[PDB]
Design a protein around this ligand. Structure first.
Ligand SMILES: Nc1nc2c(ncn2[C@@H]2O[C@H](COP(=O)(O)OP(=O)(O)OP(=O)(O)O)[C@@H](O)[C@H]2O)c(=O)[nH]1
Ligand SMILES: Nc1nc2c(ncn2[C@@H]2O[C@H](COP(=O)(O)OP(=O)(O)OP(=O)(O)O)[C@@H](O)[C@H]2O)c(=O)[nH]1
Ligand SMILES: Nc1nc2c(ncn2[C@@H]2O[C@H](COP(=O)(O)OP(=O)(O)O)[C@@H](O)[C@H]2O)c(=O)[nH]1
Ligand SMILES: Nc1nc2c(ncn2[C@@H]2O[C@H](COP(=O)(O)OP(=O)(O)O)[C@@H](O)[C@H]2O)c(=O)[nH]1
Ligand SMILES: [Mg+2]
Ligand SMILES: [Mg+2]
Lengths: 433, 130, 430, 428, 429
């Protein structure tokens, strides 16, 4: 057995958690009450424990410094799926302030969260580690998550920690200081995370507008799409797959150096449910779509970088012969530039389980899909954009008093910014020759 | 054209392999105490700045008390000065009025003295007329 | 961050405060008895931010009404929604402040302040999660200005971790009650710069000018001025009263709006501009255009005369979210020179389905513009013209004040102007 | 609450007091016996257990004749005998006798009675003192009383209604001496003084009321109307109220500059159409309606308080004041950015039955601080100088214990006051 | 300021004093028994100023009648209203003063003065609020002049805070009783300048001239002269006897009339001028014009020869107050030069409905004019002409007087003249 514990922090982490666990239940035949009328796989036990009443309960913890969002989980469709103990809330949020989440408010609830995590870990016979969902921009998603990561490294020394982080976008952002929070949390979390899958709200927002014909996407629209991508990545841990069969394999296959641990996620196909009956996309078509920037989870140009690793995770009606034929034509037409020290190639995995969509949602049910995870130096463009916004404000010390007022020193800003300048330099050095 | 496929794994709901297009050109601890130390230093800075704020507010309360007391002291000095100026005036006026009446009565007393002298002078002529 | 405690002090404070409670009660479906008779769950979702739930299904404003004279309190009690207020929350003296900041702040106000604090303590202690305080008052009189700033300082001492928010009415010779208004205002601004987290500058000069020039009211009354204030107050508090993502609480609003602690004076803007009797269109493009219009500002400053440090824009009524987003982007792109380049994405937009009372569509702008220095300069010039000759000063020194307090208050307000000008001239190549 | 104590000194103060309290009773529905078959009237009237409403007033005179008319008149039950205080011999038009010789024998009694009235106040606003400048009691006893009130009540507000002397009705050649002496002594003890020139009221009675030869009854009924207008803001709760402190703060820029000019309109004959808010407001800036003879065009305004009564709405007041703000001829000092304070009360002007004044729907009393009022001091000081240069009548004052140094000191203080009005009117 | 105590001394004093009581009693509705039989409340309003209320409803004059000889007092008792006086208030000696000031002031008068003080003290002590004293006397005889001024000094000593008022008859060679009248007058003026607050100068020179020239009486008697005096006395005391605002008491009159302590000698004026019981009215303009007419002054001075320091004008009878006010303004405007510019508003006017006995309309003027120096100059010249030769001086030194008293009295009266002249020439500059 190889259990994974999911940790959802703040509004973004909790609401994305709702979308993920709804999808997992649909994929495994688990009802909102936890019952499963159950051939069969059995691998779903990596994400679900079982109770004496035959109920399947997520190995998850939902944490927020304010109760409103988690309260919807406590009284919603899936209220029976979770035990009250795993839904943890405080009274007052971090007010979009990293210093408030990490140093002032977070400090009062960390021990309670770690106790609940310990209780879930005690129920694991072969704990793999953690999957942490949070935003870069919120005070809780940034401040509380970095504080949690630090303690998890103390209590679970070896154990893998994977992140699903929401990169900020002006179209849906709620705070001017999100660049501060993003840099501050990245600096503190960097040495504690083994692999982090960034999702740029702008990239998802544009995919919803372009591919799903949604005029003004809401968090529900964004989260359902994010859940598809998360499900594609976790499918091989919840079903008896062949690639990324344990958490350590994500680091082995995608992360050649500890600091450069931010793979770019690309997903296809994203098709509207209201599309006038479309003929199903082939393996060649969905594979070609992996190399189109319009399908990426983070806005950046892989042409301006080099690949260090590439994982193709196919799902549904897919045969190796069609994958190899698709890759062969792409290489003939395109320059898929890898760094000098890595082999130019792909690790391919096929998970036979079909792509599942939420009934009544925006996504159309398809016969085959693919999620490419590539560690490219192009993702440094995202750091450059964030660092520039940070520098514009920090040059004037705009909003800095909010952080200092919470006990954080002004020097932490310079230290965090210097660490991200070294990270940008690392991406440049690694892509050199 | 030269594509090398290497089989990796096979399982019940999956199949995996690696495809190599070209080989590489170049072949080849936080502690709980430390965390606690940082959080406590931040809490002390927060506490220190709040204490400095309350100390400043306490100095405002002290000023508020000094201004009420100053208004009271000015009113008391006004009363005191008004009282002594009035007492000076009434006493000086009483002394002047008494002096004016003493001078007038003294003039009338001198007239009486003179009249007795006139009558005495008459007696040395009246009867004393052989 | 749930409950807000509202305080209204003096004549102006209680007059605009009563109008605020009338407007939001109507919007939330609350009648003068406190009973909910609306037909939307959106109205009750966050009603506990401003209302307490009392015996039966009644809602009572978390409001404390203050004055140093009983007259204003009686008029509020007899007004349209006067019965909705908690009777024990009316705290009033008998002496008055004689339009004198020193009397409100140091002598008469000092004698009443503990009775007010007892009532606000009772309200605050029963809060599950107190956000902070909201004070409505004028700066030109004695009670609202002097006693109101004394209350702010006392509340800051007991609740140093809560947000202090004010709706401060700035005096104007156009509609004046007393000759010493520039003194009272300067002494109050000195207090506000140091002790508030966010202050909405409601300028009687701007309100008069909107009524006279735009609404064509030859002779505006306080009632005409207060109709603009009640609409503005409804607009700026939309995000606190209805479910939403952006600036949903007093602290998150302050984090988005205040880049430097002293620069917390907001220039409110509103569209469309209407009179009480004009219950007679406004498209999304037209509503957005009013953000840069001096004729729509509730502070007598021109937004084209400075630069926006931060802006919160709130659209209300049935309209396309997509159209609002498009127009807001267009306004920033077409007016680049009026936003500081060193605060990226400084304009946040919110859309609420519920329009303000009497309107079908509206837009409210909460701006932190460096143009607000024009308001402070105007007060400062009026102050200097009087202080240069020490006119009326004996009424303040008679209360125990020293002339040094006047010089200090004036100096701090002149420093506030310089600070705005410094950031107005600041470039992204510091 | 918010009580005001009225003190009527000498014949002028007492006779004006009769007219005022008669008018207040009519305005509040109080019968001459004190019975009353708003609530703000309690500022001027206390209540006894028997339901009787009694004036918060003291009537003082050094001779009993005038107060005896109150004691045996229509309103004899209104006042308790204790509040009507008289001696046996008057001050014989001599400040020295009112202040020293005769006044000192009755001050303690007067102060005791004032203390008894103050003890019945829960929020004493201040004192309103009515007196002439010209009489020996009105000048000398009032100055002594004001000094003693500053001792017993410190800075508690003291406002005056002072009768400025006029030859057409004056009774003494030495009135200029008494006026300057009382003004010098009282200056630092008074917070605000409303001067009423007898010649101005006399001319208004002749011109506006068609009275060939006005008597004190004619003058006092008109004065009674002006006083009522000033105090109506304290005795009723109207749209805009102005208390004693608000008069002080808004009318007095400097302690010594405390003499506002009173203007009243309309004054219409009971024989003889209703004047608008704009018309009555415009009339406030016409010299013919002033209480003191002077020309505001030869001065500058420092403050203006408009006290309206009757059928008046704020909108009409603001429109009227706006047109006044545009008048080039109505000049304010450069150090006064905002010069207006408005008060409105609903009760229309009440007139005494059988009086000379007509009942109108609305009236206004303007209180303005103008440097033009210094003309009144200049006229008085000139008459003082003419006599004092020869020491004419000075022996009457010296005989009573005064010293010539007090005359020079009082005159020098008035010279400094005239200079103050000149300095305050100058541009910055 | 209620009661006045009246004293009348000597022949002249008792003769004019009896006439004063007859006139004012008639005006107040009092008959010779003391009973009120009038028909106006105005008559009784201030009756207590001159009368005490006695047993029954009777009014008794607060009057003390004094003489060193019993003659005139017997004549007063037998005259009209002789029975109205309090019998115990008649104080008289038997010796006489022989029209010698020294006899009245130092010898015979000194022997009777305590008996007079007994009576005036009794009257004064029973007053609720004593104004002061009013003395009628002549300056040319011995009792009225000498004993009268002795009484003033004794009364002043006991009542230093009360007003001392006199009606002083000045001697004239035109109707003279003795050759030493200039001596008696100068010695009395010396006393009056120092001890009285107000003195009405009733000049026999003026009274004779009015009777001779105006009334065409070829040979005037003291009865003809006294008819003018009684009318004048009625007029000047009007404000003390009837309700009014102006000069209602002796002190307020003195404060309005006396700018310098020594200059308290008034020039009384009266219109119309009539002879006894003779019925002939003047208009208000005509009445006002008489203020500047020498023919209407009871002191033989011309008001056009000096300037008025102060004036009290009293109009009596049914007339328009407005017309009186207009004419009084016109008289000051048209005669600006005859009023000192350095005493603003120095003319005060009073109007009383009750006219004097026998008249329908009248005007009385109480003037403090610098022209009064002509009266003192006339006395001084007569004094000097005699004193230069020490004529009749033994009549006084024989009574114990020293010649130095004469020099002092003369010097003081010459100083009084210089003082009037100084203020006449004074300018407002
Ligand atoms: N994709 C996505 N992004 C979200 C969601 N909710 C919030 N965000 C983004 O997360 C950022 C704001 O952080 P939040 O997660 O809401 O804040 P928080 O972690 O609860 O922290 P505080 O409320 O400030 O204490 C913005 O960039 C939002 O657009 C969501 O459900 N989906
Ligand atoms: N308006 C008005 N003025 C009056 C009245 N009575 C007197 N005066 C004026 O007051 C001045 C005289 O002072 P009074 O008040 O009569 O005298 P007093 O205060 O009683 O003082 P004495 O009698 O001298 O002790 C003159 O200018 C009079 O015209 C009156 O009833 N009305
Ligand atoms: N907008 C507005 N301003 C008012 C109102 N009432 C008074 N003011 C202004 O407030 C100032 C006077 O202060 P005020 O509140 O009446 O005095 P206080 O009772 O001592 O607080 C002046 O600037 C007035 O114009 C009102 O109802 N609306
Ligand atoms: N007017 C007037 N003068 C008189 C009368 N009797 C005497 N005289 C004058 O008084 C002076 C003489 O004084 P008199 O009073 O007779 O002497 P006395 O008895 O010593 O006072 C002379 O100037 C007389 O002309 C009188 O009845 N009327
Ligand atoms: Mg949150
Ligand atoms: Mg009097």
């Amino acid at each position: 057995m190889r259990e994974c514990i999911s940790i959802h922090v703040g509004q973004a982490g909790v609401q994305i958690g709702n979308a993920c666990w709804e999808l997992y239940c649909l994929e495994h035949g688990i009802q909102p009450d936890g019952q499963m009328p159950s051939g069969g796989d059995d691998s779903f036990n990596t994400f679900f424990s079982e109770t004496g009443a035959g109920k399947h309960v997520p190995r998850a913890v939902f944490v927020d410094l304010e109760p409103t969002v988690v309260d919807e989980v406590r009284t919603g469709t899936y209220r029976q799926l979770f035990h009250p103990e795993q839904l943890i809330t405080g009274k007052e949020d971090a007010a979009n302030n990293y210093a408030r989440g990490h140093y002032t408010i977070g400090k009062e609830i960390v021990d309670l969260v770690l106790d609940r995590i310990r209780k879930l870990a005690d129920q694991c016979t072969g704990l793999q580690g953690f999957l942490i969902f949070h935003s870069f921009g919120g005070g809780t998603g940034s401040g509380f998550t970095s504080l949690l990561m630090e303690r998890l490294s103390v209590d679970y020394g070896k154990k893998s920690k994977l992140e699903f982080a929401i990169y900020p976008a002006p179209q849906v952002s709620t705070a001017v200081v999100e660049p501060y929070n993003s840099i501050l949390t990245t600096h503190t979390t960097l040495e504690h995370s083994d692999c982090a899958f960034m999702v740029d709200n702008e990239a998802i927002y544009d995919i919803c507008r372009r591919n799903l014909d949604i005029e003004r996407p809401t968090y529900t629209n964004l989260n359902r799409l994010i859940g598809q991508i998360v499900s594609s990545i976790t499918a091989s841990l919840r079903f008896d797959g062949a690639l990324n069969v344990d958490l350590t394999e994500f680091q082995t296959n995608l992360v050649p150096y500890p600091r450069i641990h931010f793979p770019l996620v690309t997903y296809a196909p994203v098709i509207s449910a209201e599309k006038a009956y479309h003929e199903q996309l082939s393996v060649a078509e969905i594979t070609n779509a992996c190399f189109e920037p319009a399908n990426q989870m983070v806005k950046c140009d892989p042409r301006h970088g080099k690949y260090m690793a590439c994982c193709m995770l196919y799902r549904g009606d897919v045969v190796p012969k069609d994958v190899n034929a698709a890759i062969a034509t792409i290489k003939t037409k395109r320059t898929i530039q890898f760094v000098d020290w890595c082999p130019t190639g792909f690790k391919v995995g096929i998970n036979y389980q079909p792509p599942t969509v939420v009934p009544g949602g925006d996504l159309a049910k398809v016969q085959r899909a693919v999620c490419m995870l590539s560690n490219t130096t192009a993702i440094a463009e995202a750091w450059a954009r964030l660092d520039h916004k940070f520098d514009l404000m920090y040059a004037k010390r705009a909003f800095v008093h909010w952080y200092v007022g919470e006990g954080m020193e002004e020097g932490e800003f310079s230290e965090a910014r210097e660490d991200l300048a070294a990270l940008e330099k690392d991406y440049e050095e690694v892509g050199m020759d | 054209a030269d594509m090398e496929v290497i089989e990796l794994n096979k399982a019940t709901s999956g199949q995996s392999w690696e495809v190599i297009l070209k080989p590489p050109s170049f072949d080849g601890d936080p502690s709980l105490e430390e965390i606690q130390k940082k959080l406590e230093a931040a809490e002390e800075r927060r506490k220190y700045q709040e204490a400095e704020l309350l100390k400043h507010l306490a100095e405002k309360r002290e000023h508020e008390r000094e201004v009420i007391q100053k208004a009271i002291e000015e009113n008391n000095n006004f009363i005191k000065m008004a009282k002594e100026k009035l007492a000076q005036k009434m006493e000086s006026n009483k002394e002047n009025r008494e002096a004016h009446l003493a001078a007038m009565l003294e003039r009338l007393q001198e007239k009486d003295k003179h009249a007795e002298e006139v009558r005495k002078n008459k007696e040395l002529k009246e009867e004393a007329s052989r | 961050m749930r409950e807000i405690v509202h305080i209204q002090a003096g004549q102006c404070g209680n007059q605009i405060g009563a109008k605020f409670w009338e407007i939001i009660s109507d919007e939330h479906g609350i009648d003068a008895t406190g009973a909910y008779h609306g037909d939307s769950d959106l109205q009750l979702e966050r009603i506990n931010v401003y209302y307490n739930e009392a015996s039966g299904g009644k809602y009572v404003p978390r409001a404390v009404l203050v004055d140093l004279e009983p007259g204003t309190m009686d008029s509020v009690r007899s007004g349209p929604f006067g019965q909705i207020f908690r009777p024990d929350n009316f705290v009033f003296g008998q002496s008055g402040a004689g339009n004198n900041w020193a009397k409100g702040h140091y002598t008469e106000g000092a004698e009443l302040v503990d009775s007010v604090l007892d009532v606000v303590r009772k309200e605050a202690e029963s809060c599950d999660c107190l956000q902070g305080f909201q004070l409505t008052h004028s700066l030109g009189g004695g009670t609202g200005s002097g006693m109101g700033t004394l209350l702010i300082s006392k509340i800051r001492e007991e609740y140093p971790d809560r947000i202090m928010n004010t709706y401060s009415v700035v005096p104007s010779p156009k509609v004046s009650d007393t000759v010493v208004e520039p003194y009272n205002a300067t002494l109050s601004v000195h207090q506000l710069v140091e002790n508030t987290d966010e202050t909405y500058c409601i300028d009687n000069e701007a309100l008069y000018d909107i009524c006279f020039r735009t609404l064509k009211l030859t002779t505006p009354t306080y009632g005409d001025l207060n109709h603009l204030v009640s609409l503005t107050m409804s607009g700026v508090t939309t995000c606190l009263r209805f479910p939403g993502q952006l600036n949903a609480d007093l602290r998150k609003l302050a984090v988005n709006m205040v880049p430097f602690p002293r620069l917390h004076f907001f220039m409110p803007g509103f569209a469309p501009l209407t009179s009480r009797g004009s219950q007679q269109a406004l498209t999304v493009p037209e509503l957005t255009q009013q953000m840069f219009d001096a004729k729509n500002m509730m502070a007598a400053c021109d937004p084209r005369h400075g630069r926006y440090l931060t802006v919160a824009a709130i659209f209300r009524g049935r309209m396309s979210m997509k159209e609002v987003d498009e127009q807001m982007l267009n306004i920033q792109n077409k007016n680049s020179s009026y936003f500081v380049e060193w605060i990226p994405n400084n304009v946040k937009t919110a859309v609420c389905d519920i329009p303000p009372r009497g309107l079908k569509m509206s837009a409210t702008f909460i701006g932190n513009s460096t143009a607000i220095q024009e308001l402070f300069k105007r007060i400062s010039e009026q102050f200097t013209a009087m202080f240069r000759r020490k006119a009326f000063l004996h009424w303040y020194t008679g209360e125990g004040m020293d002339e040094m307090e006047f010089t200090e208050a004036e100096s701090n307000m002149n420093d506030l102007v310089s600070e705005y000008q410094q950031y107005q001239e600041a470039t992204a190549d510091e």
